[PDB]
Write an enzyme that holds these catalytic residues in place. Structure first.
Site, short mmCIF file in Angstrom:
data_model
loop_
_atom_site.label_atom_id
_atom_site.label_comp_id
_atom_site.label_asym_id
_atom_site.label_seq_id
_atom_site.Cartn_x
_atom_site.Cartn_y
_atom_site.Cartn_z
CG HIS B 327 -12.91 2.50 1.30
ND1 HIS B 327 -12.36 1.74 2.48
CD2 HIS B 327 -11.98 2.81 0.49
CE1 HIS B 327 -10.93 1.71 2.03
NE2 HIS B 327 -10.76 2.52 1.02
N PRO B 328 -13.48 4.09 4.61
CG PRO B 328 -12.18 3.49 6.15
CD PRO B 328 -13.28 2.87 5.17
CD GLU B 357 -9.04 7.63 6.57
OE1 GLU B 357 -8.39 6.51 6.34
OE2 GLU B 357 -9.02 8.51 5.60
CD1 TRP B 459 5.15 -14.67 -12.22
CD2 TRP B 459 5.61 -12.63 -11.81
NE1 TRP B 459 4.70 -14.13 -11.05
CE2 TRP B 459 4.68 -12.87 -10.90
CE3 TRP B 459 6.34 -11.20 -11.63
CZ2 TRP B 459 4.41 -11.95 -9.88
CZ3 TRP B 459 5.92 -10.30 -10.83
CH2 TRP B 459 4.87 -10.67 -9.86
CG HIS B 487 -2.62 -2.14 -7.03
ND1 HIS B 487 -2.71 -0.99 -6.36
CD2 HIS B 487 -3.08 -3.02 -5.92
CE1 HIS B 487 -3.11 -1.17 -5.25
NE2 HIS B 487 -3.40 -2.48 -5.10
#
Ligand SMILES: *[C@@H]1O[C@H](CO)[C@@H](O[C@@H]2O[C@H](CO)[C@@H](O)[C@H](O)[C@H]2NC(C)=O)[C@H](O)[C@H]1NC(C)=O
Ligand SMILES: *[C@@H]1O[C@H](CO)[C@@H](O[C@@H]2O[C@H](CO)[C@@H](O)[C@H](O)[C@H]2NC(C)=O)[C@H](O)[C@H]1NC(C)=O
Ligand SMILES: *[C@@H]1O[C@H](CO)[C@@H](O[C@@H]2O[C@H](CO)[C@@H](O)[C@H](O)[C@H]2NC(C)=O)[C@H](O)[C@H]1NC(C)=O
Ligand SMILES: *[C@@H]1O[C@H](CO)[C@@H](O[C@@H]2O[C@H](CO)[C@@H](O)[C@H](O)[C@H]2NC(C)=O)[C@H](O)[C@H]1NC(C)=O
Ligand SMILES: *[C@@H]1O[C@H](CO)[C@@H](O[C@@H]2O[C@H](CO)[C@@H](O)[C@H](O)[C@H]2NC(C)=O)[C@H](O)[C@H]1NC(C)=O
Ligand SMILES: *[C@@H]1O[C@H](CO)[C@@H](O)[C@H](O)[C@H]1NC(C)=O
Lengths: 97, 597
Positions: B327-328, B357, B459, B487
């Site tokens: 994964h780069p 990158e 929410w 997350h």
């Protein structure tokens, strides 16, 4: 060394700077605090000689370099080391300098 | 004596022991990532455990130098980033419970299995599964199923664990002299005592809610355009004044609208620039891509690659059975050792990922002279804001034709610039309300404003008000929809993705004004210009040495984040949308609902 060459060390803590052409080999424990530690490492008492961890996959500027500094002096002795005197061929029966 | 002078000789030994152990840990991790076997998982967590105990003891030793008697700034900033307790301020059994909860929360998400009601023998994982059903499928009930089943299977196990995780996290954060866990998170954009560059923890909320009020006039027009375009893909399922059903936005949660491009493409048959047949007909490879990505930075005024980068990186998938998780990534193992690990194929997406990158390797090479504890971006959203402007500049149709990938006689017209700008807006401006609303709900729920019996109510109230999407199925207090995101169930901060999106365009407008650009902002190119490289390097080289509000001042000339460059980048698209929604209804009503009809 792949895995680390810890044979090379260097001094990190000294009370006062060196003199020109002076050499220290002391291994006494440096004291950065206000309490003596009696030659035992711990808080505010460091071992003064850290090690280089040279590995081959480092970056230039972290790789080892071998240095040789030369120093010439002429105290009072009226002969010593000096380089080579070159001599050419030799002719005969000719007025020459 | 002079407690300030003992801290200097303590950070004088730390900066070396840590620099020696971190390299071991990083190399052991690289050896595993690039080559997975049975012992490279052992001698990598060995080094991880040997590097964690060192830091955990050096913090105990550093707890002896009071931050008051210190007077310098670098030594204070280094001690202040080493004195942090974090956990291990709770009890022992309470820390054990917190760790068990945190390890049980991520494996309910990682191994979630949603089963078909008609064929419940075989079921679907998330990624090779629902993540492609929600992407390509154009059926209403199929998407409704793939949404509700996942929110009800992995949505009801995380609730009784999240309820306790909130309490334990708050209890930990209050023992570190914060007031809750939200404040602990916001205490990354905090600057104290610099006499003109201060930034309190309570100002991040105000700044975020102040910059979001200027994005609404653009998000509203985009929402109206996408609503009118979706009314033709699913007719009679969308009201022309209401919100959007929360399971038609292109993915599982609605974070990116980028998969809505096939339906809402502005101008018909006009394929945007894609240099992928020119690459394979000119015979490029995984070496030419990086050699062309490096010449860009060398032209802009930045150094070369270190020649240990070329003979130690792994930029090709290993053809044989040498399985490697690629994964780069840009690694910074230390001691001047920079490497890049990515599986490079000959496509323009990899052509841009290479620039992205390498924009990290340049940042890392810049501040490599700082002390060990000050080698990072100015704050959270800097190391990616710097990487993204490079890929913004490398994809313009003017840098492509001067690189040998786009025919010279190629002429661009506005009917394709509009397509490019709309494809960019679905990714850039489509995620700002989602990010802001999610991190607002989290802050409010950590501070205690939202009681535990009104979580989903607030929410969905906020989802209808701020971002403007409505749920298709009613959700009582047995659900936890926010915890259905990677997350949230894995304890990550989610506000760096909001500040990065603004820092990015601030940097782009600041740099490509020093390049003396003339036309629109979305055409800027910083190639062959050293006034931009020398203006970026004066911020890249600081690291965490100076406050982020001073690192910002160097490039852009302002002391805070601003949303005016982000609105000046999308001005053509805004002008097009504005006089295209004359027959539509800009805005939405928070009374419609796809189930109460
Ligand atoms: C990937 O890892 C495996 C397992 O460690 C390596 O397999 C052996 O690695 C040792 C390491 O020095 C070599 O001496 C052996 O010759 C390797 N044997 C085989 C059958 O591979 C493997 O070499 C690693 N991959 C690479 C490219 O080194
Ligand atoms: C404490 O702060 C002073 C500045 O207030 C630092 O002084 C600089 O030190 C660097 C070397 O690290 C020199 O290159 C600079 O020239 C110094 N500044 C000036 C104005 O000459 C000092 O380094 C700091 N303390 C530590 C331990 O780094
Ligand atoms: C990190 O935790 C340590 C203890 O784990 C804190 O040091 C103690 O703090 C308490 C309360 O302020 C004092 O009563 C003790 O005298 C301190 N020293 C000990 C227990 O040896 C330390 O203050 C914490 N760090 C921060 C930044 O709060
Ligand atoms: C792209 O630019 C062209 C002209 O460069 C635009 O064509 C004109 O658009 C105006 C706008 O109403 C019309 O009044 C003119 O009649 C158009 N020209 C012709 C010759 O018919 C075109 O509209 C622009 N496209 C976009 C999407 O902005
Ligand atoms: C950046 O500068 C280089 C060097 O001047 C440019 O490369 C030249 O491009 C012109 C026009 O295509 C050619 O005639 C020259 O032969 C090229 N020289 C070399 C050494 O390649 C390059 O086009 C410039 N790129 C941009 C985007 O301005
Ligand atoms: C960078 O590398 C290239 C190799 O093609 C070389 O020609 C150039 O001189 C190098 N630049 C610097 C600043 O070393």
């Amino acid at each position: 060394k792949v895995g680390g060459n810890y044979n090379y060390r260097y001094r990190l803590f000294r009370k006062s700077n060196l003199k020109p052409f002076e050499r220290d080999i002391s291994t006494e424990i440096y004291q950065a605090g206000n309490k003596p530690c009696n030659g035992v490492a711990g808080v505010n008492c460091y071992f003064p000689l850290q090690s280089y961890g040279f590995r081959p996959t480092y970056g230039v500027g972290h790789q080892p370099y071998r240095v040789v500094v030369l120093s010439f002096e002429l105290l009072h002795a009226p002969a010593t080391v000096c380089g080579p005197k070159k001599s050419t061929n030799l002719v005969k029966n000719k007025c020459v300098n | 004596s002079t407690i300030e002078e003992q801290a200097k000789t303590f950070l004088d030994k730390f900066n070396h022991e840590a620099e020696d152990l971190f390299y071991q840990s990083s190399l052991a991790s690289w050896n595993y990532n690039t080559n997975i076997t049975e012992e490279n998982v052992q001698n990598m967590n060995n080094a991880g455990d040997k590097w964690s105990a060192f830091l955990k003891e050096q913090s105990t030793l550093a707890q002896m130098y009071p931050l008051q008697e210190i007077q310098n700034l670098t030594v204070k900033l280094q001690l202040q980033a080493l004195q942090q307790n974090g956990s291990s301020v709770l009890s022992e059994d309470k820390s054990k419970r917190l760790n068990t909860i945190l390890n049980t929360m991520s494996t309910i998400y990682s191994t979630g299995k949603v089963c078909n009601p008609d064929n419940p023998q075989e079921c679907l994982l998330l990624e090779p599964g629902l993540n492609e059903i929600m992407a390509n499928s154009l059926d209403y009930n199929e998407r409704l199923w793939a949404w509700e089943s996942w929110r009800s299977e992995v949505g009801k196990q995380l609730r009784p664990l999240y309820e306790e995780y909130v309490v334990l996290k708050n209890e930990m954060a209050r023992a570190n002299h914060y007031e809750d866990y939200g404040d602990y998170w916001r205490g990354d954009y905090e600057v104290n005592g610099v006499d003109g560059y201060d930034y309190s923890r309570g100002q991040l909320i105000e700044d975020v809610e102040h910059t979001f009020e200027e994005i609404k006039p653009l998000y509203e027009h985009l929402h109206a355009y996408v609503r009118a375009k979706l009314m033709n893909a699913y007719p009679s399922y969308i009201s022309p004044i209401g919100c959007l059903p929360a399971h038609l936005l292109g993915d599982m949660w609605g974070r990116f609208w980028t998969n809505l491009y096939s339906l809402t493409v502005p101008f018909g048959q006009k394929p945007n620039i894609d240099v992928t047949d020119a690459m394979v007909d000119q015979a490029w490879d995984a070496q030419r891509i990086f050699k062309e990505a490096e010449k860009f930075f060398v032209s802009v005024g930045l150094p070369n690659m270190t020649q240990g980068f070329w003979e130690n990186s792994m930029l090709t998938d290993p053809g044989n059975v040498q399985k490697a998780v690629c994964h780069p990534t840009a690694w910074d193992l230390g001691k001047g050792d920079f490497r890049i690990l990515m599986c490079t194929k000959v496509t323009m997406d990899d052509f841009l990922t290479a620039h992205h990158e390498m924009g990290h390797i340049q940042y890392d090479m810049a501040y490599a002279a700082q002390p060990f504890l000050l080698r990072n971006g100015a704050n959270e959203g800097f190391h990616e804001a710097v990487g993204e402007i490079m890929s913004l500049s490398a994809a313009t149709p003017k840098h492509l034709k001067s690189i040998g990938l786009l025919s010279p006689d190629f002429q661009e017209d506005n009917e394709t610039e509009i397509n490019f700008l709309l494809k960019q807006a679905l990714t850039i401006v489509g995620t700002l309300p989602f990010t802001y609303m999610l991190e607002k709900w989290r802050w409010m729920v950590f501070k205690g404003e939202i009681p535990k019996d009104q979580w989903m109510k607030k929410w969905w109230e906020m989802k209808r008000e701020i971002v403007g999407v409505v749920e298709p199925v009613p959700h009582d207090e047995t659900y936890c929809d926010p915890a259905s995101l990677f997350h949230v169930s894995n304890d990550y901060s989610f506000i760096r993705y909001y500040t990065r999106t603004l820092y990015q365009f601030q940097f782009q407008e600041a740099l490509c004004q020093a390049a003396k650009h003339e036309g629109p902002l979305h055409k800027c190119d910083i190639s062959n210009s050293t006034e931009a490289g020398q203006k970026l390097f004066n911020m890249l080289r600081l690291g965490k040495s100076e406050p982020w509000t001073l690192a910002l001042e160097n490039v852009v000339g302002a002391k805070n984040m601003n949303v005016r460059p982000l609105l000046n980048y999308f001005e053509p698209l805004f002008t097009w949308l504005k006089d295209q929604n004359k027959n539509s209804f800009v805005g939405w009503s928070t009374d419609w609902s796809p189930y109460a009809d």
